[PDB]
Structures are given as structure tokens and as C-alpha cells.
Amino acid sequence: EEKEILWNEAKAFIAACYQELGKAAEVKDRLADIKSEIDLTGSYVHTKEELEHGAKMAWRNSNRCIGRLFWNSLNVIDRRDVRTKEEVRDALFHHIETATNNGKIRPTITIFPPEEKGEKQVEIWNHQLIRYAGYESDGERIGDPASCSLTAACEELGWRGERTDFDLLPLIFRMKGDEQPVWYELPRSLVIEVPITHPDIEAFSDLELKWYGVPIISDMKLEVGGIHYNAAPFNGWYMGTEIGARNLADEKRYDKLKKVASVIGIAADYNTDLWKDQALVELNKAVLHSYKKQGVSIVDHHTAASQFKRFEEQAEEAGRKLTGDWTWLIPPISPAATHIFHRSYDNSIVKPNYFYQDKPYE
Amino acid sequence: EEKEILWNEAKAFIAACYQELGKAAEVKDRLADIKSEIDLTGSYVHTKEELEHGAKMAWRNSNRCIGRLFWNSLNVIDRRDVRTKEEVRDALFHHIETATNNGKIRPTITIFPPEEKGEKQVEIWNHQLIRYAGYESDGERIGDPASCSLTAACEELGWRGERTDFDLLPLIFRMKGDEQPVWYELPRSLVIEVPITHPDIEAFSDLELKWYGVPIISDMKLEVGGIHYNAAPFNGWYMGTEIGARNLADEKRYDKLKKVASVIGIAADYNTDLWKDQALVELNKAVLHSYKKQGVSIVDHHTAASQFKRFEEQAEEAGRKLTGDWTWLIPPISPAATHIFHRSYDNSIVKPNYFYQDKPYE
Numbered sequence: 037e038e039k040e041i042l043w044n045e046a047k048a049f050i051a052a053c054y055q056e057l058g059k060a061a062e063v064k065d066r067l068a069d070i071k072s073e074i075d076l077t078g079s080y081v082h083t084k085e086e087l088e089h090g091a092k093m094a095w096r097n098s099n100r101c102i103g104r105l106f107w108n109s110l111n112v113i114d115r116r117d118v119r120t121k122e123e124v125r126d127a128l129f130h131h132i133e134t135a136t137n138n139g140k141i142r143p144t145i146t147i148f149p150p151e152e153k154g155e156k157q158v159e160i161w162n163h164q165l166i167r168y169a170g171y172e173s174d175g176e177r178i179g180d181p182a183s184c185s186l187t188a189a190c191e192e193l194g195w196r197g198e199r200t201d202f203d204l205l206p207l208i209f210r211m212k213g214d215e216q217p218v219w220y221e222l223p224r225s226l227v228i229e230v231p232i233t234h235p236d237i238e239a240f241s242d243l244e245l246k247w248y249g250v251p252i253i254s255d256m257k258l259e260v261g262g263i264h265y266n267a268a269p270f271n272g273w274y275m276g277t278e279i280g281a282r283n284l285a286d287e288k289r290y291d292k293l294k295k296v297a298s299v300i301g302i303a304a305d306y307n308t309d310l311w312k313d314q315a316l317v318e319l320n321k322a323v324l325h326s327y328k329k330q331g332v333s334i335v336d337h338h339t340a341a342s343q344f345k346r347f348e349e350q351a352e353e354a355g356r357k358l359t360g361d362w363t364w365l366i367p368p369i370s371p372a373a374t375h376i377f378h379r380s381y382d383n384s385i386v387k388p389n390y391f392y393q394d395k396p397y398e
Numbered sequence: 399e400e401k402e403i404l405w406n407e408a409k410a411f412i413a414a415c416y417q418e419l420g421k422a423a424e425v426k427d428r429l430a431d432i433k434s435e436i437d438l439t440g441s442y443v444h445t446k447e448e449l450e451h452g453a454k455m456a457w458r459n460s461n462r463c464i465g466r467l468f469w470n471s472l473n474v475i476d477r478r479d480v481r482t483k484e485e486v487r488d489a490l491f492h493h494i495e496t497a498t499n500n501g502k503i504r505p506t507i508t509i510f511p512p513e514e515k516g517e518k519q520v521e522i523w524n525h526q527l528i529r530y531a532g533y534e535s536d537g538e539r540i541g542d543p544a545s546c547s548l549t550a551a552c553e554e555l556g557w558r559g560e561r562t563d564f565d566l567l568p569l570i571f572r573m574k575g576d577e578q579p580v581w582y583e584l585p586r587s588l589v590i591e592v593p594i595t596h597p598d599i600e601a602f603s604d605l606e607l608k609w610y611g612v613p614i615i616s617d618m619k620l621e622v623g624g625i626h627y628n629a630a631p632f633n634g635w636y637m638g639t640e641i642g643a644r645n646l647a648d649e650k651r652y653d654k655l656k657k658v659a660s661v662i663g664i665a666a667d668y669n670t671d672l673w674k675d676q677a678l679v680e681l682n683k684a685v686l687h688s689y690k691k692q693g694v695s696i697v698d699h700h701t702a703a704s705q706f707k708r709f710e711e712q713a714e715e716a717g718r719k720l721t722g723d724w725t726w727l728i729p730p731i732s733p734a735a736t737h738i739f740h741r742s743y744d745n746s747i748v749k750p751n752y753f754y755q756d757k758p759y760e
């Protein structure tokens with residue numbers, strides 16, 4: 037059965053892939069080779085072209101992603117050759133470096149060897165390669181509450197955070213055959229961080245907010261043609277609302293709105309004052325300004341939505357069905373100011389795609 | 399078949415209704431009476447208790463409604479006795495008066511005779527009993543673009559708007575047997591309007607914005623126990639975002655954000671300035687302030703969401719399944735600041751409920 041699942045996915049993927057690549061005539065022979073390879077080995081190996089295009093298609097099919105206009109320019113790094121934890125580590129360091137690109141962020145994915153018989157070769161524990169630790173000890177909250185469980189697992193492994201609000205978690209991953217993951221501290225020179233200041237309100241720096249430049253999702257599974265790349269960290273640049281309206285603002289995250297309201301000189305007493313909404317806007321203005329001032333790529337949600345509209349037009353002009361998850365595509369601030377809010381999207385799952393997988397901790 | 403549909407809906411409704419009313423023992427006899435009545439007449443008549451509770455249940459089941467905490471306090475006006483257009487008119491005038499209640503808005507529904515054989519007794523054309531006309535003539539946009547088609551239909555019938563941005567549409571409805579609807583101008587003394595001013599920014603009155611006090615949806619069908627009350631206008635009070643983030647802000651509505659941005663003294667040039675978001679907040683602050691200052695009921699979206707949370711807790715404590723349409727329950731500004739955003743809702747359709755029906759114009 038597992039072989040038949042593999043085969044059907046391969047057929048569907050190869051056909052679609054080669055069609056887009058203009059290699060339609062090569063489908064027949066490639067399918068035979070894959071058929072034979074599955075029969076003998078229980079699997080098959082993607083050519084570099086298939087893999088690159090697979091990762092790009094997967095991005096293009098990510099319903100929840102507003103950034104998909106640029107799917108075709110994804111930088112795909114093929115690291116299916118890694119066998120050792122130092123190679124994995126170095127590949128992750130390299131991804132961070134080349135993705136960051138001195139602030140001019142390059143959407144990049146590094147692809148590690150795929151699961152074999154559902155056996156992972158590399159198991160990355162990080163939710164993002166760059167993320168802040170979180171602690172909760174007797175009422176005491178420090179750092180990012182979303183990182184609490186991973187932070188606790190890291191500290192089980194002999195790592196110790198300094199317990200600032202912005203401790204960088206180490207990279208943590210397990211190799212096939214090892215009982216325990218290994219962790220490596222991130223070199224600070226690799227990690228770009230942006231102090232959050234406001235263009236007009238000087239007191240805003242009193243909050244001592246910052247965030248990291250590059251969101252690098254490292255815990256999803258890339259599936260291409262029935263091959264499961266469980267370890268395939270990818271990054272884009274941030275849309276400002278992800279930082280200003282969620283990471284810094286959410287009550288279950290950094291929860292900064294009351295402090296924001298205080299530094300911008302408004303009372304945080306009455307719902308009817310819309311102080312949260314007002315704080316959200318200034319915080320979000322601060323984030324965009326701060327990233328721009330530092331030369332770190334970021335997009336505001338209006339521009340992102342305009343770009344997504346072009347993705348929709350591009351999809352239709354290419355005769356491709358467009359899929360989307362309205363609930364994630366709308367920005368968490370002023371969603372009704374975007375066109376996204378005023379239409380519907382088919383939330384069908386098309387493959388290749390990125391998928392959630394179970395956490396190895398917790 | 400239509401009789402069997404009616405019967406099944408009646409069985410399900412009566413059982414549920416009487417259970418909630420504590421009249422469980424009366425279900426059997428009432429069901430027999432209804433059975434006989436359907437057999438003889440092809441229909442049945444709701445008792446006042448069933449009708450009142452039906453309308454309340456329908457509100458309680460309205461997935462898209464964030465205001466459902468107060469479902470049980472809906473004021474139900476039973477006007478199934480009306481036969482003439484003057485009675486309909488007067489019932490609509492009365493609804494507006496009693497709903498408005500000098501600004502202390504009472505959620506109210508007026509229920510007119512139901513469809514018979516799918517034949518309407520009363521067909522209301524208005525989307526809301528109080529709404530502004532809209533005109534579009536050779537590039538010239540005036541009033542509410544959402545009212546353009548109804549406005550044009552009204553002007554077919556000999557009504558003429560003054561072509562201000564805030565012409566009140568007349569009530570327009572058709573009686574069974576009449577080819578044409580009739581229209582009646584709304585008495586101005588019945589319609590509360592609120593000038594929009596800002597608590598801190600005096601220039602805001604230069605926009606000369608206003609809105610009406612009471613949203614009275616008049617074009618939906620109330621269905622209770624297989625009986626279709628196609629004419630059953632209902633109202634609540636506004637949540638401020640409906641006015642500030644949609645009616646006044648939407649590009650396809652009054653489209654005031656650029657003007658708002660100008661009076662609040664910010665440039666409307668760069669997406670990264672989040673001027674739309676900032677304009678939205680000030681506009682929404684203005685709306686809440688203005689309604690409060692005038693003594694007209696309104697709720698801000700934070701308070702509304704807090705109330706909805708209580709509706710959810712009430713539903714679970716009562717053992718009732720909660721249904722909701724996440725896409726409508728989240729407010730169009732700062733949705734992620736509400737709990738609604740961070741959970742999911744089952745969008746199943748439970749009856750009794752309010753339903754869309756085809757417009758008689760366009």
C-alpha cells in the first residue's frame with residue numbers, strides 16, 4: 037500500500053511538474069525509471085529540478101500564505117547529501133546566513149534527506165531556526181511563552197538560557213540512530229535582530245523591544261511526489277503584522293499592548309477608547325519603520341495583500357486553480373482594508389505542500 | 399413532500415421549543431393538533447409563545463452574530479394580523495419607534511404573516527428599514543453605493559431622493575396581490591441619526607459624517623418550525639466597527655479613510671505608514687464616542703467579543719452546541735485582540751434561523 041501511495045503521488049507530481057517545466061515528453065521515461073526504482077528500493081530520488089520545482093510548488097500551494105506571489109523565486113538548497121550532525125548544523129548556519137543576506141532577505145529552503153520508511157534521517161526540534169526562549173517559573177514569565185516547552189526540553193539537554201526576554205534558542209535536532217537531539221548555540225553574528233523604535237515617538241525605545249530579522253519555519257514537512265522531507269526549513273521575510281500584531285501584541289506571547297499604550301501616552305482603561313487598536317497601529321508602525329531603518333526586508337500587510345492579488349491574477353492567467361485559507365490570509369489588523377477580506381477562497385489541499393508534523397518534544 | 403418537510407420541521411421545533419420552555423409534557427398534544435392542522439390546511443399557526451421563542455432561538459442560532467448573548471431578551475412583536483399596507487407601514491413605523499426607544503435601543507423583531515404556499519403576504523424591499531440612498535450617474539457617486547439598485551427601483555416608483563449623501567430611503571414593500579410595491583417616506587422624527595465627531599480632534603466634524611442609530615435588517619427570512627416568515631424585520635444596536643470599519647470606511651461604501659487621514663493630520667501616501675489602519679482607529683473611536691455622546695446604544699468590538707465569550711460559556715453550561723461563522727464573528731479591526739480569533743467555530747446551520755432570500759428588485 038505505502039508503495040502504491042508513493043507511486044500515485046509520484047505519477048501526479050511528475051506529470052504536473054514536467055508539464056510546468058515544459059518537459060512533458062520526458063514524463064513517460066522518468067515515470068518508468070521511478071516505477072522501477074520504487075519496485076527495487078521502496079522509494080525514489082528526486083532530480084534537482086524536480087526537487088527545486090517541488091519546493092516552489094509547495095509554497096505556491098500553501099493556502100495560508102499571503103506571500104506566494106514570489107513562489108517561483110524560492111532559493112532551494114539541496115542538502116540531501118548530509119549524513120552528520122556537523123553537516124546539518126553547518127547547513128542550518130548557512131541557511132540563516134544566505135537567507136538573511138545582510139538584511140536583504142532571500143526566501144530560501146534547505147532540504148535535508150527525506151524520511152525513508154517513515155524513519156526520519158534528521159529531526160529538527162526548533163519551530164523556527166531563530167526564536168526566543170520562554171520561561172515560566174512560579175508566576176514569573178520571561179521571554180516568549182510560545183517557546184516554553186521547547187525551552188524546557190533544551191534545558192533538559194544541558195543548555196541554559198540567560199533568562200532575558202530575548203534568549204536565542206539553540207538549534208536542536210536529532211539524527212537517525214541517536215536517542216537524544218544535539219543542540220548548538222546560534223552564532224550571534226549570523227542572527228540579525230531589529231530594535232523596535234517608533235518614527236515619531238521617542239519614548240517607544242523605553243520598551244526595549246526587538247525581534248529577529250528572519251522567520252525560518254523549521255518544523256514542517258515538505259511533501260513532494262510522495263516523498264516526505266520532514267526536515268526542510270524555509271524562510272521568507274516578515275509581514276509586519278506577524279511581529280506587531282501577534283508576536284509582540286498577543287496576550288499569550290509578549291503581550292506588550294498596555295506598555296505600548298503607556299509610552300504612546302494613551303489610557304488603557306476603556307474598551308470604547310480602542311486603546312488596544314490604537315496601540316496595535318503604533319506598534320505595527322514601529323515594527324515596519326524599525327525593519328526599514330535597519331535595512332531588513334519586511335512587507336506591510338497592505339502591500340502584501342496587493343502582491344497576493346497579483347498572485348491570484350497570475351494563477352488565473354496560468355489557468356491554475358487558486359487555493360487559500362481566508363482565515364490566515366486576512367491580516368490580523370485592518371483585514372477589511374484588504375481585498376482578501378471581501379472574497380472567498382477554496383481551502384482545498386493541493387500537493388506538493390508543507391504540512392504540520394508531530395513535535396518530538398512535549 | 400412540502401407538507402412532510404413542514405411536518406418534520408414542526409416536530410423538531412416544537413419538541414426543542416417546549417423542552418426549553420419546560421412544556422415537555424405538552425409536546426404530544428400540540429404535535430397532534432399541528433398534524434391535523436397541516437393535514438387540513440397545508441400549514442399550521444404558531445402560538446404566541448412558540449413564535450416568540452422561535453425568533454429568539456433563531457437569533458441564538460445565527461452563526462454570524464456576535465451579539466447573541468442577549469438572545470433571550472429579544473422583544474418579539476407579533477404582527478401576523480396585518481392585512482393592509484397601512485397596517486404594515488404603521489407596524490414598521492412602530493418597530494422603528496419602539497426599537498429606537500429614545501436611543502436606548504431594544505433588540506426587536508416585528509413578525510408579519512408568513513408565506514402560505516411559498517406565496518408572500520408581505521414582501522419588504524428594504525435591506526434595512528433605515529438606510530441611505532445611493533446614486534451613480536456619469537462618474538458622480540452620491541450616498542451609499544450599496545443602496546444604488548434599491549434607490550433606482552424606488553425612483554422607478556415615483557420617489558425622488560434629494561441626492562445628499564444621506565437621503566433616507568423610503569419604506570418599500572409589496573402586498574400579496576399587488577403588482578407594484580408601495581413606498582412611504584420615513585418620518586424624520588422616528589429616525590435617530592448621530593453626527594460623527596471625534597473626542598480629541600475638532601476638525602473631524604469637517605467631514606460632516608453621520609449615521610443612523612439603529613440597524614434594522616428587513617430583508618431576511620425567519621424560519622421557525624417549517625414556517626417561513628419572509629417578512630420579519632429585526633434590529634439590535636450597532637457594534638461600532640460596522641459603522642467605522644465598513645459603512646464609512648469601505649471603498650465600495652462611503653470610502654472616507656483618505657478624508658479621515660487628512661483631518662487627523664497624517665499623510666495618506668505610504669502603505670508602510672499604516673495610515674489606513676490609523677484612520678480606521680480614529681474613525682472608529684469617533685463613532686463610539688459620537689453614539690455614546692448622543693445617548694444612542696452602541697457596543698465596541700472588544701466588549702461585544704467579551705459578551706460573546708459569555709454566550710459561549712452560557713451555551714456550554716446549558717449543554718447547547720455552539721455554532722458560529724468565524725469569518726463574520728471576528729471584528730474587521732484588531733480581530734486578533736479578541737478571543738474569537740484564537741478559536742474555531744462549527745458553522746453548522748441550526749433551525750430556527752434567519753436566512754437570505756432573493757431580492758424582488760435588481
Ligand code: HEM
Nearest residue numbers: 095098100101102103143270271272273274275364365390
Ligand atoms: C516571502 C515572504 C513571505 C511572507 C511575507 C509570507 C507571509 C506569510 C504569512 C503572514 C503567513 C501566516 C498568515 C497568518 O499569520 O495568519 C504565512 C504562512 C505560511 N507561509 Fe508564508 N510568507 C513568505 C514566504 C514563505 C515561504 C518562502 C514559504 C515556503 C517555501 C512560505 C510558506 C508558508 C506556509 C506553509 C505558511 C503556513 C504555515 C502554517 O500553516 O502554520 N511562506 N506566510
Ligand code: HEM
Nearest residue numbers: 457460462463464465505632633634635636637726727752
Ligand atoms: C443586540 C445587538 C446586536 C449586535 C451588536 C449584533 C452584532 C452583529 C454583527 C456585528 C453582525 C455582523 C458581523 C460582521 O459584520 O461581520 C451581526 C450579524 C447578524 N446578526 Fe446580529 N447583532 C445584534 C442583534 C441581533 C439581533 C436582534 C438579531 C436577530 C434577531 C441578529 C441577527 C444577526 C444575523 C442574522 C446576522 C447575520 C446577517 C447576515 O448573514 O447577513 N442580531 N450581528
Ligand SMILES: Cc1cc(N)nc(CCc2cc(C#N)cc(NCCc3ccccn3)c2)c1
Nearest residue numbers: 251253270271272273274275278363364739740
Ligand atoms: C515562511 C514564513 C514567512 C513569514 N513571514 N511568515 C510565516 C508564518 C509562520 C506562521 C506559523 C504558524 C504556526 N504554527 C502560525 C502563524 N500565524 C498564526 C496565524 C493565525 C492564527 C490564528 C488564526 C488565524 N491565523 C504563522 C512563515
Ligand SMILES: Cc1cc(N)nc(CCc2cc(C#N)cc(NCCc3ccccn3)c2)c1
Nearest residue numbers: 377378613615632633634635636637640725726
Ligand atoms: C441586527 C443586526 C444588528 C447589528 N448590529 N448588525 C447586523 C449586521 C447586518 C449585516 C448584514 C449583512 C448583509 N447582507 C452584512 C454584514 N456585514 C458584512 C460582514 C462581512 C463581510 C465580508 C466578510 C466578513 N464579514 C452585516 C445586524
